[PDB]
């Protein structure tokens, strides 16, 4: 009654086992408001002398 | 009455357990104001000699 039960499958040719679990959560939000204002004017001084 | 209770599930084949919790908060703001000014002019000296 001791736990030195290494009578089968002695793998100590080092055998480094890894694990790498990885989760990720991500939300996002935007609010993009523009507002234009624009006005024009001109003048059209024309002439013709037939 | 000592706490050397290692009679069951002796996992000291090293068994490194990790955790990595990670939160993140992020706001942002913008204010983008433009303002155009522009004016034109021309002249139209034309002629025809039929």
- Please tell me the distance from the alpha carbon of residue B50 to that of residue B43, in angstroms, as a whole number: 23
> Are A3 and B10 contacting, i.e. CB atoms less than 8 angstroms apart?
yes
B23 touches chain A (CB under 8 A): no
In chain B, residues with a C-beta closer than 8 Å to the C-beta of A46 are: 44
- Whose CA is closest to A30, among B26, B32, B22, B24? B26
Distance from C-alpha of A28 to C-alpha of B23, rounded to nearest angstrom: 14
Give the contacts of B10 (CB within 8 A, at least 6 positions apart). Answer: A3
Nearest to A32 by CA among B29, B8, B9: B29
Q: For B10, which of A3, A38, A46 is closest by C-beta distance?
A: A3
**Residue B32: closest CA among chain A residues belongs to which residue?**
A34
CA dist B11 → A3, B7, B8, B30, B33 (Å): 11, 11, 9, 55, 65
Resolution of the experimental structure, in angstroms: 3.8
| CA pair distance A29, A20, nearest whole angstrom | 30
Q: Which residues of A touch B10 (CB under 8 A)?
A: 3
């Amino acid at each position: 009654c001791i736990t030195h039960e290494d009578y089968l499958n002695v793998v100590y040719s080092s055998s480094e086992v890894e694990k790498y679990l990885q989760s990720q959560g991500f939300t996002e939000h935007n609010e993009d408001t523009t507002s234009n204002t624009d006005e024009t004017s001109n003048q059209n001084a024309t002439s013709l002398d037939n």
